Design a protein around this ligand. Structure first.
Ligand SMILES: *[C@@](C)(CO)[C@](*)(O)[C@H](CC(C)C)NC(=O)[C@H](Cc1ccccc1)NC(=O)[C@H](CC(C)C)NC(=O)[C@H](CCc1ccccc1)NC(=O)CN1CCOCC1
Ligand SMILES: [Mg+2]
Lengths: 244, 222, 233, 195, 212, 235, 231, 240
């Protein structure tokens, strides 16, 4: 019968590893680097677009950074199509929570549920896992500013600063070197860009090959604002830090 | 509107002795004011020395008996031809009846036989499965006529010892199969006189350790 | 839940010494309208059974088809289909009785009253009734509808009990059936003069008589009846 | 099930619930507690159809307790009330709806404010200074309109509550066998044993 | 029916009558309205005979499965709740049951739970259930004290059923007594009302309404 | 790979045959049937000394009149026991009587072959089902994952089964008393066990008509072990 | 080789190897013999044990008052098929008030076994059955094979060394067929037939298993001291 | 639905998928459970290759199933969440129907049953997780400590460890833990748990998590400084 053609996606190796999860992580390691840095007064999300073409429409484009709700955003690393499936689910989950409790969903709860979906694809169903790693950046009134990451295994962890995708080894060393706890958003913005600039496989880091976003309490009095940076705004912030 | 139930009349009677038990029932089958059959048996030998009758709506009675007979058959298959005791049959019938709690079998069911000590046993059921072991039970159309007579003659109710100032009751004792059949025949002739759905014939099934014997008697046909 | 539309009235039958007789008129009523006049309500199954059906005619035609299919199914992988493993009246009846009771238990009955008349392989007479409720009974005489009220009393004068069956000949039995059909024509408003009659004998087999008529009727005394009490003219 | 009252004062929420359980012409019990603790600072009283009331209350209780364990965190009274309302809003269009009316009294630890919610079996939620279900309202609302002040203490609230119970005991046809009073505040939930 | 069960100093008394009716027709005078579930558990039966008889024997099967799985006797609370959750699933279907789950366990002590077909489940010290419950309450309440002796308690339970058996038309037959202690339940006999009434009338000097 | 319900060229189900190899790796369980009762005994085999041996539950009650010992992948037995207990209680509910030991075993064995591509594989555990009923008296059954069950006078299953079975062949006779059977299980267990037999690493049980199924205390078994050693030294 | 992974695969020569391997399970099974006359039909079965401490595996199963079979191979598969026969016999009784013909019994078993040989996932039954019965056309004996093939015979035998008993019955055909109105003599012929399949072992009291059905004889099984007569 | 039998027997009688699930447990961070006279302590390793972590929000290794029971684990982290969720739901379901919280044995038996179901259900692989379940039964002061594993077997332990280098720490506990006299106090039990982890961990900074459970739903997690005091005390006594 059909048994002959089954790859058996949800099984262990002799060493106790999930083949497909490991190979999905290998896939993600070739994706454009994405960095998240959490400051005391906000969060930074920075991501490198995958080898841009000059004729690509840059301003009306969304590849790396997506909005889940008013308080939570994600940086993507891996298959974009896979990520969008998960993002729409995460968006719906946030609205279900709001409908039920009349309160915005706590960040971890959203992260856990999305990570539980990924876990399901590794344990049952016989389907390939989602070749996606997320960096969640969000705020709630319990823990304040939070950074998480999830990967195809469905395992998630919290971070002060973290990188996903390509050159995470090199990127994480640089973040570990220059990061400190009393850091501000504006300093974190500079760190994010400097790290990408050194770890990038491109010749030079330019505005058209980047996506950028911040989550500050920079709005008027005790409320959070999401800023997805425009091309011109990235061009300015790149000059302001002295990279170009 | 379609009414799935009907009343086929008739009446049945079960009496238990010391080492025997009888289950009697008239053979008349009716609908409204018409006679369908003057001889349509409704007391059956179901095997393992158990006799059974489900009086009321005949279609439901036949279905129930048919199902219990089949239950006995499968009890043998599944439990190495073990004999189904009368108490085990009773409980099994409760589950058959209660299984249709929300669309009941419109029947009064009575079974008779011998218990595991060899003593006479009669069990009576309501339409939805409540059952009780008794020495004596009448069921069906003329049950209200027959039953108080049985209380008086079988269980000696309201009978006191002469001269004792109504202080000493008449002592209980088992009846002989001969005395019991007299009570059965007199009960049914009395019921035939005063109840229009009762008559034509009387069929009695007697159960002893030797087996199941039958006896038939004519009843008035008006 | 149904309501019968086109209906068939009484089916009458009785046992005699060597077999059974069964009869039913050829009418398909539509309420008070005597709509259809060529309706056969006696259906032979093999050469040893006749099923007489009263009530809803659409449900009767359904049963015809079931019986017809039963014969076909029994012949499958059955070298003895026309011998030892042929359909018996008791097999045909129990099948119908199972269906009728299953249908009433689903609250969607076949709105009929059926009499299965036949002769078993061992020569025994078979005559049993079943209706829309799944109720079954057997008797030396069986009748449906008005036949139960008017025919049974007449037929029971001939065969009042089991012991009268061997004493009753086919001539006497048929005479009683034909007489009963006349009485039903006098008194049943949804009856017709034309009827069919079937005899299943253990020796002569199945004899199916069609296009019979009620005859030798008494109507002459009607001319003397004037008014409703006092009127003399 | 008949009388359930609720009064939100300055620093606490007070719930009063009748003790009588009547079936037919017999008062089967006169010490029934018509309330469940949903969380350390949230209390729900209930009234309505027999069986449904307790079944619903305990179902909600289990769900809130499950949440508390999962997140190691207490849900706000507002969040709990919204959850309860949605369950009743689902219920009303079910094959067999829960015929249960509830009051949810809670103390929000983040806001440091008492909160009283009234939710009927249709899923109609309202936040109130004082609330009641059933025929109780027809007497108590007008009484509280008159005597209630928003800055009252817990002790003043209890005296105000005594005034309601007295009026009900005077004019109500049925004998409801007094009330169990419970207070919800910053220190959690406690019962007044002598009322 | 009339059934009762009350809690007292020396444990639990349980008393029931034995009549069964189908309208005004007295169908039986020898019905067991107490179901022995286990050595420490009892169940009273009022309302639909079949419903009570069927589901309370089913309850005993569930209580047996519990002690097999958990290696421990089921609590009265858990036992009563299995039955109450069961009837609640059938709510609206037309079950008629008014039961009382009586028993003793170490953690609970003597405990009585009232459970009915419309889902009600109540813990309490005194309950009377059935068509003659009011007549039983009248006698029971007026003579009840916690400090009753085992002898006096048994009599009160018996006398309360007799009171109902007398006045209520659908109550009668005979009285079945039970006493539940820390050691388990103890049967205290079947008492025919036919003899018991006159015996009580003579000895107690009550029932003056009746022609002696 | 290959189908789960596949026949080998020799005419056996691969998976059933492989599950039998798993049972050979399991701890020893011995059952002996007498006219005074049936005795069931097992090797606990704690994987480490820190493990509390009393929590090792390899002897199990199914009903008051039926007991059960296991060997192999013991985790697989839980649903088998659950089914057996339900079957036993359900039959009592339907028929107001105790259920025959054979009928109980048959009910358990019906689960065995309900696997394929129902559960995904056969059970990796063998069961010794011991009990009593009015018809056939004291009985001992060996229920395999093949769906087959044999009645036995005595039976050993597990790692030391072939050695113990040969020993049971010589020692068993039809007039064994209960006390003699108890000692015989202990004796044979001590022979095939790796570690030295004591009350903590071995467990006894029995089923009698009078007292029903009973698992013995460690105090009671310890005395039987001491009684056993003295009797062997006595000749 | 490459074509025996499942039942859904044909070999290049047109063979179903899984069905053949199921057939092999019957050859390993203990011998059982079937034979009939015109009045009676008899099953004789050599029961097998695990060891001296074990019981002897029951080979014969009753299906109705007038029908039953003996098994050889996987016993659980016989239990499934016999249970199916019991239901079909029972369906025929309840619905048609008719005893199920032994020929139809065979046709029903054939069709049930066949479905398992044409579908993926399932497996063939690993048991051979000898069905005997007495119906409206007299005594019958059927041989069921899990390939689906059912065959009506005067006599036969299946299991290990069944060729010896089968040769004997082929010689004795003219004799035993006319054993009418004599149960004990027909059994004797069957017991002598199964004896031709014995090696080193002989027929003992708890080893032999006999069953019979006939004109005025319901299907009944004889074990233990009841078969001591025929040794 | 996906039906494939993934967990199946091999010729030698092994279910490789269950055994490979144990290898995943062996890869996981070390977890230790030690029960004293009036308490149970659950110690857990946290690997120090992960700096820049946010310990406030990062899922803790020890999880509360109810107010009186806790569950730690070793192996696949994602898999553990599914077992913990099921256990928490069952804990509330038990309180609802039995009107009493679960015993530690019952909760362990449930979790173990779930793990077993995944070893012979079609279309699923076994949980790559072994758990240590600890707590106190309702109205009981006897400490309980259970272990489960992918196969579905469970058992009670006086002290036990699971995860990577668990054989080393088990060796330590086997000679250092006395059955006749367990850790009489909370301090003694915590110290022994920390000592045992110090055989394997590396540094006693933010690598060791300790959670103490006491009777009547008294559970508390120790902070860094509190744990560090034990580490400092043990090392000074070691130099001898
Ligand atoms: C006191 C004695 C009276 O209320 C108690 O409450 C007892 C409880 C004891 C017996 C367990 N209750 C009854 O006796 C109870 C009253 C009752 C009647 C009908 C419905 C609900 C409650 N009686 C019964 O349950 C009787 C028991 C008989 C005597 C064995 N059963 C019936 O009345 C049956 C079945 C009733 C039923 C319930 C639900 C669905 C369908 C049916 N009905 C009949 O027997 C009908 N009828 C009787 C006359 O013969 C023709 C058919
Ligand atoms: Mg009359």
């Amino acid at each position: 019968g059909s048994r002959r053609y089954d790859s058996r996606t949800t099984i262990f190796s002799p060493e106790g590893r999930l083949y497909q999860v490991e190979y999905a992580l290998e896939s993600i390691s070739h994706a454009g680097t994405a960095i998240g840095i959490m400051a005391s007064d906000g969060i930074v999300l920075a991501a490198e677009r995958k080898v841009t073409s000059t004729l690509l429409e840059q301003d009306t484009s969304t590849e790396k950074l997506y909005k889940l709700n008013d308080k939570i955003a994600v940086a993507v690393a891996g298959l974009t199509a896979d990520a969008e499936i998960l993002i729409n689910t995460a968006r719906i989950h946030a609205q279900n929570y709001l409908k039920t409790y009349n309160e915005d969903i706590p960040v971890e709860i959203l992260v856990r549920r999305l990570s539980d979906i990924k876990q399901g694809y590794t344990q049952h169903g016989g389907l390939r896992p989602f070749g996606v790693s997320f960096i969640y950046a969000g705020y709630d009134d319990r823990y304040g500013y939070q950074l998480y990451t999830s990967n195809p295994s469905g395992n998630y962890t919290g971070w002060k600063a973290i990188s996903v995708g390509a050159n995470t080894s090199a990127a994480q060393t640089l973040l570990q070197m220059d990061y400190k706890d009393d850091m501000k958003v504006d300093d974190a913005i500079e760190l994010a860009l400097k790290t990408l600039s050194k770890t990038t496989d491109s010749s030079a880091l330019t505005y058209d090959r980047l996506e950028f976003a911040t989550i500050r309490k920079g709005a008027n009095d005790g409320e959070v604002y999401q800023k997805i940076f425009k091309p011109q705004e990235i061009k300015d912030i790149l000059v302001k830090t002295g990279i170009t | 509107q379609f009414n799935p139930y009907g009343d086929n009349g008739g009446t049945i009677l079960g009496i238990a002795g010391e080492d025997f038990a009888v289950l009697a029932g008239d053979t008349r089958n009716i609908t409204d004011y018409s006679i369908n059959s003057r001889y349509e048996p409704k007391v059956f030998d179901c095997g393992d020395n158990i006799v059974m009758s489900a009086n009321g709506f005949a279609a439901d009675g036949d279905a129930l008996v048919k199902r219990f007979k089949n239950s006995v058959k499968w009890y043998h298959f599944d439990h190495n031809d073990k004999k189904l005791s009368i108490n085990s049959a009773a409980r099994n019938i409760q589950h058959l009846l209660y299984g249709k709690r929300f669309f009941p079998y419109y029947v009064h069911t009575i079974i008779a036989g011998l218990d595991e000590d060899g003593k006479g046993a009669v069990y009576s059921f309501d339409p939805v499965g409540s059952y009780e072991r008794e020495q004596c039970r009448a069921g069906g159309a003329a049950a209200s006529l027959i039953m108080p007579f049985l209380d008086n003659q079988v269980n000696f109710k309201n009978q006191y010892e002469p001269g004792t100032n109504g202080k000493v009751k008449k002592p209980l004792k088992y009846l002989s199969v001969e005395e019991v059949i007299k009570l059965v025949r007199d009960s049914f002739t009395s019921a035939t006189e005063r109840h229009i759905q009762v008559g034509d014939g009387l069929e009695i099934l007697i159960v002893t350790k030797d087996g199941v014997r039958k006896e038939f008697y004519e009843l008035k046909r008006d | 839940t149904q309501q019968p539309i086109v209906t068939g009235t009484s089916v009458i039958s009785m046992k005699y010494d060597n077999g059974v007789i069964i009869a039913a008129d050829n009418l398909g009523s539509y309420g008070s309208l005597l709509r259809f006049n060529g309706v056969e309500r006696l259906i032979p199954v093999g050469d040893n059974t006749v099923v007489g059906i009263s009530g809803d005619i659409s449900d009767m035609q359904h049963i015809e088809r079931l019986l017809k299919d039963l014969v076909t199914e029994n012949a499958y992988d059955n070298p003895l289909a026309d011998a030892e493993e042929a359909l018996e009246p008791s097999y045909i009846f129990e099948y119908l009785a199972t269906v009728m009771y299953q249908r009433r238990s689903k609250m969607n009955p076949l709105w009929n009253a059926i009499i299965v008349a036949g002769v078993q392989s061992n020569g025994d007479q078979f005559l049993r009734y079943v209706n829309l409720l799944g109720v079954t009974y057997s008797s030396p005489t069986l009748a449906t509808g008005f036949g139960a009220h008017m025919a049974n009393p007449l037929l029971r004068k001939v065969v009042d009990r089991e012991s009268d069956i061997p004493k009753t000949t086919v001539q006497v039995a048929e005479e009683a059936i034909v007489n009963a059909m006349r009485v039903l024509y006098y008194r049943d408003a949804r009856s017709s003069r034309n009827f069919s009659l079937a005899i299943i004998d253990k020796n002569t087999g199945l004899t199916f008589k069609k296009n019979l008529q009620v005859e030798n009727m008494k109507w002459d005394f009607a001319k003397d009846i004037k008014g409703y009490g006092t009127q003399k003219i | 099930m008949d009388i359930i009252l609720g009064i939100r004062v300055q620093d606490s929420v007070i719930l009063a619930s009748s003790k009588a359980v009547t079936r037919g012409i017999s008062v089967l019990k006169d010490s029934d507690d018509k309330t469940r603790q949903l969380s350390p600072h949230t209390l729900m009283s209930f009234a309505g159809e027999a069986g449904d009331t307790v079944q619903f209350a305990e179902y909600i209780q289990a769900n809130i307790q499950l949440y508390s364990i999962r997140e190691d965190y207490e849900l706000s009274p507002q969040a709990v009330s919204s959850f309860v309302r949605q369950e009743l809003a689902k219920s009303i269009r079910s094959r067999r709806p829960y015929q249960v009316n509830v009051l949810i009294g809670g103390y929000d630890k983040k806001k440091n404010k008492p909160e009283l919610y009234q939710i009927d079996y249709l899923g109609t939620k309202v936040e109130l200074p004082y609330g009641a279900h059933g025929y109780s309202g027809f007497y108590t609302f007008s009484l509280l309109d008159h005597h209630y002040r928003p800055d009252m203490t817990t002790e003043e609230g209890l005296d105000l509550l005594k005034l309601c119970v007295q009026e009900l005991e005077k004019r109500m046809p049925m004998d409801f066998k007094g009330v169990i009073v419970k207070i919800v505040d910053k220190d959690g939930i406690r019962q007044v044993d002598d009322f | 029916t009339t059934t009762l069960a009350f809690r007292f100093q020396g444990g639990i008394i349980v008393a029931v009558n034995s009549r069964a009716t189908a309208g005004n027709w007295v169908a039986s005078q020898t019905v067991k309205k107490v179901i022995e579930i286990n050595p420490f558990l009892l169940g009273t039966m009022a309302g639909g005979a079949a419903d009570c008889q069927f589901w309370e024997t089913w309850l005993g099967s569930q209580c047996r499965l519990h002690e097999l799985r958990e290696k421990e006797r089921i609590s009265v609370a858990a036992a009563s709740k299995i039955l109450s959750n069961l009837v609640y699933q059938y709510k609206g279907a037309g079950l008629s049951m008014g039961t009382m789950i009586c028993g003793y366990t170490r953690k609970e002590g003597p405990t009585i739970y009232y459970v009915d077909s419309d889902g009600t489940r109540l813990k309490g010290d005194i309950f009377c259930v059935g068509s003659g419950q009011t007549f039983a309450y009248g006698v029971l309440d007026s003579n009840y004290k916690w400090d009753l002796s085992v002898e006096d308690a048994l009599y009160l339970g018996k006398r309360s059923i007799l009171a109902a058996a007398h006045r209520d038309a659908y109550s009668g037959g005979s009285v079945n007594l039970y006493h539940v202690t820390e050691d388990g339940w103890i049967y205290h006999g079947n008492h025919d009302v036919g003899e018991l009434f006159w015996k009580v009338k003579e000895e107690e000097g009550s029932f003056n309404n009746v022609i002696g | 790979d290959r189908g789960v319900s596949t026949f080998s060229p020799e005419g056996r189900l691969f998976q059933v045959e492989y599950s039998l190899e798993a049972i050979k790796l399991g701890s020893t369980a011995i059952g002996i049937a007498t006219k005074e009762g049936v005795v069931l005994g097992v090797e606990k085999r704690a994987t480490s000394p820190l493990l509390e041996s009393d929590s090792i539950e390899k002897i199990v009650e199914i009903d008051r009149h039926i007991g059960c010992a296991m060997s192999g992948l013991t985790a697989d037995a839980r649903s088998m026991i659950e089914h057996a207990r339900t079957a036993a209680v359900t039959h009592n509910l339907y028929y107001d009587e105790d259920i025959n030991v054979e009928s109980l075993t048959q009910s358990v064995c019906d689960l065995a072959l309900r696997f394929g591509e129902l559960m995904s594989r056969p059970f990796g555990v063998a069961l010794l089902i011991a009990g009593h009923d009015a018809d056939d008296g004291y009985q001992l059954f060996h229920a395999e994952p093949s769906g087959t069950f044999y009645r036995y006078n005595a039976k050993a299953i597990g790692s030391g089964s072939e050695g113990a079975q040969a020993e049971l062949l010589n020692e068993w006779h039809s007039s064994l008393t209960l006390k003699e059977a108890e000692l015989l299980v202990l004796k044979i267990l001590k022979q095939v066990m790796e570690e030295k037999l004591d009350e903590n690493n071995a467990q006894l049980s029995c089923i009698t008509k009078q007292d029903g199924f009973k698992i013995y205390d460690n105090e009671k078994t310890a005395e039987l072990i001491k009684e056993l050693k003295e009797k062997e030294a006595a000749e | 080789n490459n074509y025996d992974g499942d039942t859904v695969t044909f070999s290049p020569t047109g063979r179903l190897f899984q069905v053949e391997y199921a057939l092999e399970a019957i050859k390993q099974g203990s011998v059982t013999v079937g034979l009939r006359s015109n009045t009676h039909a008899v099953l004789v079965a050599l029961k097998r044990n695990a060891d001296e401490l074990s019981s002897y595996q029951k080979k014969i199963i009753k299906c109705d008052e007038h029908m039953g079979l003996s098994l050889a191979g996987l016993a659980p598969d016989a239990r499934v098929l016999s249970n199916y026969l019991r239901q079909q016999c029972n369906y025929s009784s309840l619905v048609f008030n008719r005893k199920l013909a032994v020929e139809r019994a065979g046709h029903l078993l054939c069709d049930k076994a066949q479905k398992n040989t044409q579908s993926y996932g399932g497996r063939p039954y690993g048991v051979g059955l000898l069905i005997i019965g007495y119906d409206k056309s007299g005594a019958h004996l059927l041989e069921f094979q899990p390939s689906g093939n059912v065959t009506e015979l005067y006599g036969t035998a299946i299991g290990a060394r069944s060729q010896g008993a089968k040769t004997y019955l082929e010689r004795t055909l003219d004799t035993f067929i006319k054993i009418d109105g004599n149960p004990d003599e027909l059994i004797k012929a069957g017991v002598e037939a199964i004896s031709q399949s014995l090696r080193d072992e002989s027929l003992t009291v708890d080893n032999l298993s006999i069953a019979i059905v006939g004109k005025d004889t319901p299907f009944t099984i004889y074990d233990g001291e009841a078969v001591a007569k025929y040794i | 639905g996906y039906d494939r039998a993934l967990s199946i027997f091999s010729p030698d009688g092994h279910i490789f998928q269950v055994e490979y699930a144990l290898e995943a447990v062996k890869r996981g961070t070390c977890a230790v459970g030690v029960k004293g006279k009036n308490c149970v302590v659950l110690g857990c390793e946290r690997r120090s290759t992960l700096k820049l972590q946010d310990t406030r929000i990062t899922p803790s290794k020890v999880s509360k199933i109810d107010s009186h029971v806790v569950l730690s684990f070793s192996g696949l982290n994602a898999d553990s969440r599914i077992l913990i969720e099921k256990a928490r739901v069952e804990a509330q379901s038990h309180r609802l129907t039995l009107e009493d919280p679960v015993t530690v044995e019952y909760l362990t038996r449930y979790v173990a049953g779930v793990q077993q179901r995944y070893t012979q259900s079609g279309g699923v692989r076994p949980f790559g997780v072994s758990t240590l379940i600890a707590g106190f039964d309702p109205r009981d002061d006897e400490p309980k400590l259970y272990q489960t594993e992918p196969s579905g077997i469970y058992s009670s332990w006086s002290a036990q460890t699971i995860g990577r280098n668990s054989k080393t720490v088990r060796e330590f506990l086997e000679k250092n833990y006395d059955r006749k006299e367990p850790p009489a106090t909370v301090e003694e039990c915590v110290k022994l748990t920390v000592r045992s982890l110090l055989e394997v961990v590396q540094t006693g900074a933010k690598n060791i998590e300790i959670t103490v459970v006491k009777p009547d739903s008294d559970i508390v997690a120790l902070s860094s400084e509190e744990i560090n005091q034990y580490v400092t005390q043990i090392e000074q006594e070691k130099q001898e």
